[PDB]
Amino acid sequence: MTTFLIKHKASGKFLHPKGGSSNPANDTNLVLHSDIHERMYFQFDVVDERWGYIKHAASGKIVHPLGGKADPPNETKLVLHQDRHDRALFAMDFFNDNIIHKAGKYIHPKGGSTNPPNETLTVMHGDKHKAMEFIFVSPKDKDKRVLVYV
Amino acid sequence: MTTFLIKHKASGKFLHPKGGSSNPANDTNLVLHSDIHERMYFQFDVVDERWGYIKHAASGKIVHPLGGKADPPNETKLVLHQDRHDRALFAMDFFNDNIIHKAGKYIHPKGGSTNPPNETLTVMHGDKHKAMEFIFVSPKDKDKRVLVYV
Amino acid sequence: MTTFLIKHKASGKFLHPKGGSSNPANDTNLVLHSDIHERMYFQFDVVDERWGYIKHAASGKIVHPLGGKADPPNETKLVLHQDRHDRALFAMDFFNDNIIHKAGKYIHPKGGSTNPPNETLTVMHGDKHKAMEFIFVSPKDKDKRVLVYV
Amino acid sequence: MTTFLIKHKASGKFLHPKGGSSNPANDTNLVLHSDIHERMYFQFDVVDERWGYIKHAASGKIVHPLGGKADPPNETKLVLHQDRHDRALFAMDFFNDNIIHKAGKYIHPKGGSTNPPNETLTVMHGDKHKAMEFIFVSPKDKDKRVLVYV
Amino acid sequence: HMTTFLIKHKASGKFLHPKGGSSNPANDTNLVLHSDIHERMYFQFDVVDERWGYIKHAASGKIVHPLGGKADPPNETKLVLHQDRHDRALFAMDFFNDNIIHKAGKYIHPKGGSTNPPNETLTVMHGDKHKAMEFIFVSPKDKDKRVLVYV
Amino acid sequence: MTTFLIKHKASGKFLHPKGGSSNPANDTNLVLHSDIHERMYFQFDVVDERWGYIKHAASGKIVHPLGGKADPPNETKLVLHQDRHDRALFAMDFFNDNIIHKAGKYIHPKGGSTNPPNETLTVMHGDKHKAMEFIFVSPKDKDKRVLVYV
Amino acid sequence: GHMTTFLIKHKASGKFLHPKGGSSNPANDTNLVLHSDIHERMYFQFDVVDERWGYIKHAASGKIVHPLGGKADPPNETKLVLHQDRHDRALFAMDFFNDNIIHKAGKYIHPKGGSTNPPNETLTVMHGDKHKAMEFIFVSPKDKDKRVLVYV
Amino acid sequence: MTTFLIKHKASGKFLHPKGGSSNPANDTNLVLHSDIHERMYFQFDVVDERWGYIKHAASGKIVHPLGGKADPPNETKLVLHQDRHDRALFAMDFFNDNIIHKAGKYIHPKGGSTNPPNETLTVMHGDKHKAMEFIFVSPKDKDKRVLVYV
């Protein structure tokens, strides 16, 4: 079971549930926050080769694009929800350092800042740049990349 | 251990030990050949996050740059060899579809052809282009990609 | 490649995959049985001087200490498994008549009897005595020793 | 066929024809000397399982107990001779690290010393101890054991 | 030479603004809370006496006053921008307890005391200390980075 | 270049280098003493918002917990030292009237007296009370507070 | 006296590394320049982090050497600045055998323009070239010709 | 102080006192050997900037050029000796990966092989090449370099 932190490469902030709860409600926004604590730990459950569910370790809820478009448009907010469904499939690209949804868009901080402030929402967007890059690091060492597929 | 074929993307040929031996001798060349059978199956030994050994399934021998240098120059031949050491580390980049050595060069067919004939050698070359793309697929379905870090 | 029978010297029984299948599943126990047939033929693939894989001829699976640990404790069961790795390395000592694992223990009949009944399991044990002795003989002449290193 | 050096384990010296000739005369003694060169390389030609001829690589002559008797007494000198016959059968025990003649005695340094001087003769003798141990090593790396049975 | 900063209401993350967001608010314009960030809500601090100084709206140069300009304003006195400089407009920026204190000892509060005041909530003086009157002083380019307002 | 006296609020004594030396050695203790002179003048060098170095004006040495540990335990002596690093970072809380270390403990007179006698040592301690209050005053008026940040 | 203080001497010219302006507490992103002068405001220390890699520390300020901007692989011609921040993009090694200062990503500290005789106030910049003009030696505050060990 | 292994970079063997004694006699040769244990751990006592004593940890004896010339010639044997003298000053060049004596020659394997056998003597020699490269590693991890100047 590899528990990891999802670190925004450009700012050093991390993916958090909005509120930091061990049990965020369904459709709780996924934000960037500088803090580190067990309630921002994630896991990845491989489903089909590169594709799987990004799972909030404390609640078991997984990352979803808000709604059910399957092919979400740019600026679609990312949330947590207990449901498992194909539209919640992502890949964790540790070679290009990004997170790609099954329909081909990536997780971004909303607005594209290299230094997004705490509580900035995350959204889907097709663009590629240094501000949408994320790396996956050890909870006991924020500079140690860990393999999220194992 | 999950077993996969290393398929040259442009041609559909596969990486082989030279000669097709179940127990190829040390320093046997790795070549592209169209045949599929048990003796060209591969596995991947994770060592450190993305880095590991590419292992020949039938013998347990792993892929080495000829000469075993830490930082091999272009055109260093790829072979099999029993030694397991940090100079034979590669990553399987299934997002950009290539195989990269620890010192930063990639596995290429010697000469760079997108449709190399059977028995073409492989070498280390630092450039990135199409003729060096490889995908990792199921032995029982050569068109279905499989996750090698698991 | 020489094919041979692994004969328990004291009893004349032979090592078998428990059940006699031609393709035993991973982790099938190795047992002693008196019968001779093609599904108890073995081969030896040299890896590094004295060390190699003991291979079930009919299935291509090799002998492993159950659990695949590098340094298995006494009574660890011997099984057949498809993986090839350092922890499945043995030497076939045809001078002292035993089978030694890379970490220094030997193949024994479970319980150490000089006359074990059919289906007796085999286990690893560090002790040396007459009940852990094995000789390597021709499938067509169970009393003629054959060279397993060739 | 594998070419090797016969190294006295206790002293690190090697087995030589007396005088170091590329074509020793019949009945030339075999001695211990520390030097390494092509005229002290050996090969093993397997005849029957463990039994074979110890062949001087440069000349093709093989190791004999002087006189060619089937059951040589203690202190019988070892020599080279071109004749090939059963009384010249030895086995290369790479598990107990010794060389045994078919009638059951071993090759020794004359006198049984752990550190014999250069040009010390070799003789047959039934005793087993540290000073009659030999290992069989690569001509390019005198500490690397090689399998003489291939 | 004088640092520029945002005055962020700690509990809500809203900011002190001139009501209307103008870069030249008239004298006696109310100071309100609002989520927006732009250069017309930047402030500066002009030190006058150790901890005491003028809180200055960067775009207009007008400073924060208790409405009416009394030396000892009562609770609920509205805070405004005014161009005059005088010793009844002296405040200290307490970056250790996270509040803004007037020379006579009352603090800047959102009117109504909410940890979540809506946009346009007025600000007033009140003597009470609690989490709804806490403010932090942050960089215009990084709303989570506290900056030193005295230097 | 604001120079100031560090005055113990309850007693009116001041922070001195032990000995009143213009050039105190590394690890010289910081005591309380009634005297006023150029050798007990201090400065504060800002490094990060509230955080900076408390600097002995005459020597340029700064205030350290003895040993310079990140999380010094209660009763850790305060000393002078020339080296600048993160464990010698303090904030001058002129609103609550105390001196706080980066790890959260405060500078106290050893023993907690509201009237410590001359030569009382100072130490780190986590308690807040009247005897650990300090004010920062003009060298030309011990009752005139001065801004230490500007 | 506790951590080795030293001067960073440009070998070809004999000038030293200074903070532009010569301050004891230079602001963040202050450029590092070259200057003939000696004073305790150009003293440096080296804080070891991982074997050869560590932080080059302006002794008086306590701020550390960074490629301007904090990029891991600064392009050639990136000026060197002093910043209070500490992170992985400010790791350097002090090669006192080949006489250079190397960044974790492999480029060296140079005088801007590569002169063996750079003028006062010459900026320093990162760059991949190796030559007699990018060589530095690390010397004692009490003897500009005495090399001192910067790693203890 | 700090303890390390002196690893011949090209072969992975280490420096040892010949014989492996925890108290080698004065003038014992320094040799190469594959083993790792407590009586081949080294320390480095700094004397003058880069110059210091290479110290055998178990005995405290330091490395000397054999004999007494100030400026020893190529092929001068390296030995251990308890004496401290300026003729035993070396620098541990961890940037170019070599060990240089005060008079300007380097420590080499006798004969200059990239794969010297166990017991190979070490000598001074002025040449620089791959076979005289050494790295200084942790006793617990032969591949992890450690800082020897501390």
Ligand SMILES: OC[C@H]1O[C@@H](O[C@H]2[C@H](O)[C@@H](O)[C@@H](O)O[C@@H]2CO)[C@H](O)[C@@H](O)[C@H]1O
């Ligand atoms: O929000 C992540 C993406 O933002 C893009 O920019 C937004 C921007 O807020 C809007 O003003 C306009 O530029 O279109 C975009 C909305 O889809 C970034 O430019 C893009 O790179 C992403 O990071």
Ligand SMILES: OC[C@H]1O[C@@H](O[C@H]2[C@H](O)[C@@H](O)[C@@H](O)O[C@@H]2CO)[C@H](O)[C@@H](O)[C@H]1O
């Ligand atoms: O061999 C891998 C590379 O082949 C390159 O071509 C070689 C080749 O040996 C020969 O055709 C001649 O041109 O020298 C070249 C040196 O690399 C390809 O151009 C290159 O992309 C690699 O795949």
Ligand SMILES: OC[C@H]1O[C@@H](O[C@H]2[C@H](O)[C@@H](O)[C@@H](O)O[C@@H]2CO)[C@H](O)[C@@H](O)[C@H]1O
């Ligand atoms: O255990 C190895 C031996 O199995 C023998 O057959 C077993 C059989 O597998 C089991 O199902 C039951 O019938 O007991 C039998 C005992 O004969 C094979 O016949 C024997 O050849 C071994 O392979």
Ligand SMILES: OC[C@H]1O[C@@H](O[C@H]2[C@H](O)[C@@H](O)[C@@H](O)O[C@@H]2CO)[C@H](O)[C@@H](O)[C@H]1O
């Ligand atoms: O010494 C080994 C040889 O013994 C031979 O006996 C004779 C041999 O016939 C003769 O050629 C000469 O070598 O003297 C030997 C001692 O009498 C065996 O006949 C020969 O086969 C070798 O074994």
Ligand SMILES: OC[C@H]1O[C@@H](O[C@H]2[C@H](O)[C@@H](O)[C@@H](O)O[C@@H]2CO)[C@H](O)[C@@H](O)[C@H]1O
């Ligand atoms: O030749 C090797 C053997 O040496 C034997 O020693 C002789 C010994 O030389 C002689 O003086 C007398 O003791 O008879 C012994 C038997 O031949 C050793 O006894 C034996 O160990 C061998 O190594």
Ligand SMILES: OC[C@H]1O[C@@H](O[C@H]2[C@H](O)[C@@H](O)[C@@H](O)O[C@@H]2CO)[C@H](O)[C@@H](O)[C@H]1O
């Ligand atoms: O009118 C007073 C407010 O005006 C704001 O203008 C705003 C609007 O009211 C606000 O909701 C924002 O999101 O968009 C408008 C810009 O056209 C000022 O920014 C603000 O200070 C208020 O005081």
Ligand SMILES: OC[C@H]1O[C@@H](O[C@H]2[C@H](O)[C@@H](O)[C@@H](O)O[C@@H]2CO)[C@H](O)[C@@H](O)[C@H]1O
């Ligand atoms: O106005 C700032 C003060 O509000 C006080 O409470 C208000 C209350 O919230 C409001 O709705 C009305 O009842 O008047 C009260 C008394 O002024 C807070 O209690 C006080 O602490 C201030 O924040």
Ligand SMILES: OC[C@H]1O[C@@H](O[C@H]2[C@H](O)[C@@H](O)[C@@H](O)O[C@@H]2CO)[C@H](O)[C@@H](O)[C@H]1O
């Ligand atoms: O030194 C400042 C603090 O001293 C405390 O007294 C110590 C002391 O070591 C001993 O009296 C015992 O009570 O442990 C105390 C630490 O908790 C004062 O009690 C405390 O108020 C501080 O001033």
Ligand SMILES: OC[C@H]1O[C@@H](O[C@H]2[C@H](O)[C@@H](O)[C@@H](O)O[C@@H]2CO)[C@H](O)[C@@H](O)[C@H]1O
């Ligand atoms: O730039 C670093 C050097 O500046 C010197 O000061 C300069 C500077 O131009 C200005 O501050 C003025 O004082 O003129 C000086 C010309 O020499 C520092 O004094 C010098 O030590 C350097 O650090």
Ligand SMILES: OC[C@H]1O[C@@H](O[C@H]2[C@H](O)[C@@H](O)[C@@H](O)O[C@@H]2CO)[C@H](O)[C@@H](O)[C@H]1O
């Ligand atoms: O130069 C080292 C520092 O760079 C910081 O970023 C700079 C950068 O120039 C720009 O992005 C803006 O934010 O100003 C910063 C100066 O503080 C790094 O983020 C910081 O780590 C320092 O290393």
Ligand SMILES: OC[C@H]1O[C@@H](O[C@H]2[C@H](O)[C@@H](O)[C@@H](O)O[C@@H]2CO)[C@H](O)[C@@H](O)[C@H]1O
């Ligand atoms: O900065 C030191 C380097 O100077 C370089 O000279 C120019 C160079 O020609 C230009 O391409 C760019 O790098 O600007 C440099 C001066 O700022 C030298 O080419 C290089 O060797 C270094 O000395």
Ligand SMILES: OC[C@H]1O[C@@H](O)[C@H](O)[C@@H](O)[C@H]1O
């Ligand atoms: O919005 C997310 C935030 O929520 C808070 O409750 C938590 O304490 C923060 O550390 C962060 O999780």
Ligand SMILES: OC[C@H]1O[C@@H](O)[C@H](O)[C@@H](O)[C@H]1O
């Ligand atoms: O919001 C995320 C998604 O979660 C589930 O409910 C479902 O797949 C969609 O209905 C959508 O709500």
Ligand SMILES: OC[C@H]1O[C@@H](O)[C@H](O)[C@@H](O)[C@H]1O
């Ligand atoms: O070079 C690789 C090849 O080896 C040959 O012996 C065989 O004909 C092919 O199937 C292929 O495996």
Ligand SMILES: OC[C@H]1O[C@@H](O)[C@H](O)[C@@H](O)[C@H]1O
């Ligand atoms: O060519 C492959 C092999 O080459 C040897 O020279 C090297 O030492 C081995 O470890 C292996 O890499």
Ligand SMILES: OC[C@H]1O[C@@H](O)[C@H](O)[C@@H](O)[C@H]1O
């Ligand atoms: O039973 C032995 C086997 O056990 C597995 O857990 C391991 O993955 C295999 O590779 C092999 O070691």
